């Protein structure tokens, strides 16, 4: 499956520093370009459905299991605003909606989509979202969700602005509490959709290589050709493991009961 | 900016003072975010804010971003007015569906317009807002 987090948030309805990306609203920027939430599935993970939902506080989802990136673009363009702003909660809701819409047991990859520029104080969204170091009575909480996904909060701006807004700090704290849900914020300056695409491009883990190979089997009238590379397993480590390649040849020898 | 900070941080909650303090934070940001934070938190759920010179006078992203973030649940989870001439229109812009969620959409539209109108720099926007205030406060200098 696929997971898409359309940041329909009132906080995520304003520019970053001076003006929007495509000289207009976030919807125009989303229409002009998108992250790796759909490109990876279009290229590699063909067998996957996406739940185009724009939501902050409640599951306002209308898109069923479908691979149409046009629906995702429309939903992202429709992510104008709402009455909430919480990156981790948005990621959790997006993952839950994607699981409930595209497929229950189908893996997906959700990320955090919110502005987060609320300010440290009475309305910090990290305080009400990063709640994992206590509550032993409710240790079996929604975090971690029953799906392998690393929620990542995008960051491409100045270091001083990232530290004052506490975006990278809260993201790193959430990743540490969630045990790696989020890459290291190694990005700064006026950066395009490259860090976000890198952090959201992990939804192509089920790709394949449509190649071919051949084999030699002497001068018999019934030969055999090796298949593609198999799945590695713990059989014999030897020096070190590595992905397999096209095998040279086999040999049909022996005859036993069928 | 100092006068706006004095008028806003004081015991009064003047809509003009709050809008000026948020707008005057365009000079110093994100280093001088204290004034913007005080303007955003103080007027997050003001309600009775008679303002009619904030939509066009303010052109920086931060001024509209404060109101947009206030419209969410991180800024009091309350309704606000963001249409042009909202102070006078309050008789015909009462509590409805458009003042809580539609107001957020209108703030998004205003931010989009400012992004389209990004040619107006900090100096140009400051001069235009000072000219508008001088026209309004020509006989209110006291």
Whether the link from the prior residue into A144 is cis, omega within 30° of 0, is: yes
Q: What crossing angle do the helices spanning B33-42 and B61-70 adopt, rounded to 10°?
A: 40
A17 is in an annotated binding site: no
Name which of A15, A86, A90 is nearest B73 in CA terms: A86
DSSP E strand boundaries for A19-70:
none
Residue A153's SS3 state is: strand
Name which of A164, A156, A153 is nearest A190 in CA terms: A156
A18 chain-B contacts, CB cut-off 8 A:
60-61, 118
Question: Which residues, numbered 41 to 100 in chain A, qualify as contacts with chain B under a Cβ-Cβ cut-off of 8 Å?
Answer: 56-57, 80-86
Torsion sign, CA atoms A33, A35, A36, A37:
negative
Task: Give the experimental resolution in Å.
Answer: 4.1
A9 is in an annotated binding site: yes
Beta bridge partners of A6: A54
B22 chain-A contacts, CB cut-off 8 A:
none
Interface A:B, Cβ pairs < 8 A: 117
Please list, in sequence order, all residues whose beta carbon lies within 8 angstroms of the beta carbon of residue A258, skipping any fewer than 6 positions away: none
Judge: B69–A115 Cβ closer than 8 Å, yes or no.
yes
CB atoms within 10 A of CB A245: 10
Put simply, whether A30 touches B (Cβ < 8 Å) is: no
Phi, psi torsion values for A153, nearest 5 degrees? -95, 120
- Rounded Cα gap, residues A21 and A25, in angstroms: 8
Residue A205 structure tokens: 């883990």
Residue A245 DSSP label: -
Put simply, whether A8 touches B (Cβ < 8 Å) is: no
Phi, psi torsion values for A61, nearest 5 degrees? -105, 130
Please list, in sequence order, all residues whose beta carbon lies within 8 angstroms of the beta carbon of residue B68, skipping any fewer than 6 positions away: A10, A11, A13, A14, A81, B104, B107, B108, B111
CA distances to A11, A18, A84, B48, B58 from B75, rounded to whole Å, are: 9, 22, 9, 16, 20
Three-state secondary structure along chain B?
Answer: CHHHHHHHHCCCCCHHHHHHHHHHCCCCCCCCHHHHHHHHHHCCCCCCCCCCCCCCCCCCHHHHHHHHHHCCHHHCCCCCCCCCCHHHHCCCCCCCHHHCCHHHHHHHHHHHHHHHCCCCCHHHHHHHHHHHHHHHCCCCCC
Judge: B31–A160 Cβ closer than 8 Å, yes or no.
yes
Please list, in sequence order, all residues whose beta carbon lies within 8 angstroms of the beta carbon of residue A46, skipping any fewer than 6 positions away: A67
- Rounded Cα gap, residues A162 and B5, in angstroms: 25
Residue B8 structure tokens: 């806003």
Put simply, whether A31 touches B (Cβ < 8 Å) is: no
């Amino acid at each position: 499956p696929t997971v898409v987090v359309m940041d329909v948030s009132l906080s995520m309805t304003r520019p970053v520093s001076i003006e929007g990306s495509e000289e207009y609203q976030r919807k125009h920027l989303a229409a002009h370009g998108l992250t790796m939430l759909f490109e990876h599935m279009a290229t590699n993970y063909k067998l996957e459905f996406t739940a185009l939902v724009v939501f902050s506080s409640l599951w306002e989802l209308m898109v069923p299991f479908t691979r149409d990136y046009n629906t995702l673009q429309e939903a992202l363009s429709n992510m104008d605003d709402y009455d909430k702003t919480c990156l981790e909660s948005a990621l959790v809701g997006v993952c839950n909606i994607v699981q409930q819409e595209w497929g229950g047991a189908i893996p997906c990859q959700v990320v955090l989509v919110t502005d987060g520029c609320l300010g440290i104080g009475r309305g910090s969204l990290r305080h009400s979202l990063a709640t994992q170091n206590q509550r032993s009575e409710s240790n079996r909480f929604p975090l971690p969700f029953p799906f392998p996904s690393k929620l990542y909060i995008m960051c491409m701006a100045n270091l001083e602005e990232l530290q004052s807004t506490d975006s990278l700090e809260c993201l790193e704290r959430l990743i540490d509490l969630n045990n790696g849900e989020g890459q290291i914020f190694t990005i700064d300056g006026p950066l395009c959709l490259k860090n976000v695409q890198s952090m959201f491009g992990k939804l192509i883990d089920l790709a394949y290589t449509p190649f071919h190979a051949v084999l030699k089997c002497g001068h018999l009238t019934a030969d055999v050709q090796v298949f593609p590379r198999p799945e590695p397993f713990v059989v014999d480590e030897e020096i070190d493991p590595i992905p397999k390649v096209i095998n040279t040849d086999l040999e049909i020898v022996g005859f036993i009961d069928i | 900016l100092a006068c706006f900070k004095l008028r806003a941080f004081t015991d009064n909650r003047d809509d003009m003072a709050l809008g000026h303090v948020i707008v005057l934070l365009q000079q110093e940001w994100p280093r001088g975010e204290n004034l913007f934070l005080k303007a955003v938190n103080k007027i997050c759920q003001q309600g009775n804010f008679q303002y009619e010179n904030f939509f066009n006078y303010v052109t920086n992203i931060d001024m509209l971003e404060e109101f947009a973030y206030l419209r969410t649940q991180e800024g009091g989870k309350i309704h606000l007015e963001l249409l042009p001439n909202q102070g006078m229109l309050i008789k015909h812009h009462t509590v409805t569906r458009g003042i809580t969620k539609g107001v957020k959409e209108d703030f998004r539209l205003a931010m989009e317009r400012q992004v389209s109108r990004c040619g107006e720099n900090l100096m140009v926007v400051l001069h235009r807002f000072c000219i508008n205030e001088k026209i309004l406060l020509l006989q209110t200098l006291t």
